[PDB]
Amino acid sequence: LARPLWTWSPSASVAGTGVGVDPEYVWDEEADPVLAAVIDRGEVPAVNALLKQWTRNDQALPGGLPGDLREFMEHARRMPSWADKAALDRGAQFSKTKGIYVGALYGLGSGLMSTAIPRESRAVYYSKGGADMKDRIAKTARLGYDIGDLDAYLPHGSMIVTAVKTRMVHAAVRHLLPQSPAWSQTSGGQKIPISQADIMVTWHSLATFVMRKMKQWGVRVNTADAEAYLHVWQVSAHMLGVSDEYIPATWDAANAQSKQVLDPILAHTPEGEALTEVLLGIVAELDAGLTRPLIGAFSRYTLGGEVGDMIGLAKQPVLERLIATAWPLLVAFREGLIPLPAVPAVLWTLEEALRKFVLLFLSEGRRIAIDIPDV
Ligand code: HEM
Numbered sequence: 001l002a003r004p005l006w007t008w009s010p011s012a013s014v015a016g017t018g019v020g021v022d023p024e025y026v027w028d029e030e031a032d033p034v035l036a037a038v039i040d041r042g043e044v045p046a047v048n049a050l051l052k053q054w055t056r057n058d059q060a061l062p063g064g065l066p067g068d069l070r071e072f073m074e075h076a077r078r079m080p081s082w083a084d085k086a087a088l089d090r091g092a093q094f095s096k097t098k099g100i101y102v103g104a105l106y107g108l109g110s111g112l113m114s115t116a117i118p119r120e121s122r123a124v125y126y127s128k129g130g131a132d133m134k135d136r137i138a139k140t141a142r143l144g145y146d147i148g149d150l151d152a153y154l155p156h157g158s159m160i161v162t163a164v165k166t167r168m169v170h171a172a173v174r175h176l177l178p179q180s181p182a183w184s185q186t187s188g189g190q191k192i193p194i195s196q197a198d199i200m201v202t203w204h205s206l207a208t209f210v211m212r213k214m215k216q217w218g219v220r221v222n223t224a225d226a227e228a229y230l231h232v233w234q235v236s237a238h239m240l241g242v243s244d245e246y247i248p249a250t251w252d253a254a255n256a257q258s259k260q261v262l263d264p265i266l267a268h269t270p271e272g273e274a275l276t277e278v279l280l281g282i283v284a285e286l287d288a289g290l291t292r293p294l295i296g297a298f299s300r301y302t303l304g305g306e307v308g309d310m311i312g313l314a315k316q317p318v319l320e321r322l323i324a325t326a327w328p329l330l331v332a333f334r335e336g337l338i339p340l341p342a343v344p345a346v347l348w349t350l351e352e353a354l355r356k357f358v359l360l361f362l363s364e365g366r367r368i369a370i371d372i373p374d375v
Pocket of ligand 1 (some may be wrong): 119169173
């Protein structure tokens with residue numbers, strides 16, 4: 001009669017109005033047919049070589065693209081009319097100021113959580129025409145870093161480039177994955193992967209999750225910075241091809257949506273299990289000092305024991321209790337709110353290992369080109 005409105009109601013969205021179409025059955029109407037044609041015409045190797053040259057937001061598209069793709073890209077690179085440059089700048093500055101926390105949350109928190117999102121785990125696991133498993137999951141764990149880049153939407157930055165290339169990658173995947181019998185057979189009846197709804201689930205595992213955890217830890221998030229961070233994520237969802245009718249307009253909307261669309265779908269899968277082990281291995285192999293028990297303990301603290309158990313993160317009760325008691329003290333100290341706290345030495349070691357992890361994930365994604373898959 002008049003209590004919970006549908007989570008996909010356009011009423012709580014950036015568009016604010018619209019017809020009301022279930023995003024489970026919406027993909028990318030503009031990109032999908034273009035990428036299907038590019039792949040079917042055998043144009044992927046040439047297109048990748050042309051697009052390798054397109055690296056900065058203010059750059060003209062390389063000459064020589066197929067006309068349909070050129071037209072798509074010229075449209076896709078446009079910022080929405082509701083993008084606010086000042087807020088975008090503020091959100092980028094906030095992300096940098098709080099970089100150890102955001103970077104740790106994206107890399108460990110959202111990256112490990114992704115192995116409990118069955119559709120994302122299955123798509124990544126079964127995708128064939130890009131790079132190897134190890135490279136793929138490392139790139140999955142780095143989602144958030146490009147969006148949160150300090151220069152993301154400036155003329156010399158690259159997030160428009162990254163967003164447009166990602167939109168094209170996803171569109172290619174939608175043409176490719178249904179041709180994989182292992183993907184089709186495990187898809188639970190979804191005919192085409194990476195629906196709008198699926199993108200928004202993943203978005204909640206990033207934006208909404210990171211904000212929640214920063215606030216819980218006592219990071220100083222004033223209202224204006226919270227709003228600017230949301231704005232970065234809203235504009236980025238649009239540039240990835242999410243219709244404005246599905247992007248939450250406010251934190252209240254986003255927080256309520258995450259509870260309904262992300263929390264209930266988290267599940268262990270065989271594919272996700274494989275990916276968790278690969279990611280845990282990748283992180284432990286970095287020159288960061290993140291040992292398996294530190295990763296486990298900090299990730300369980302970050303995700304909670306229910307999700308940690310679902311993923312299979314081994315129990316570290318001594319370190320988890322040390323972290324729960326003292327990590328908020330380290331945060332308060334770094335926020336300038338308390339004098340230097342007497343905490344166990346391993347807290348400072350953990351903090352340094354997280355800082356080196358974040359720097360390594362900043363270093364690695366610098367300059368890597370996003371290629372369209374084929375085959
Ligand atoms: C906010 C949401 C998302 C972001 C920011 C995002 C980002 C990206 C990026 C940057 C790439 C390019 C990887 C690279 O080559 O460097 C990519 C590729 C891919 N994405 Fe997403 N994605 C999102 C949602 C999804 C969802 C919901 C799915 C699946 C249900 C998905 C499945 C994939 C697949 C399968 C690839 C190709 C991987 C490969 O073969 O290398 N993505 N995505």
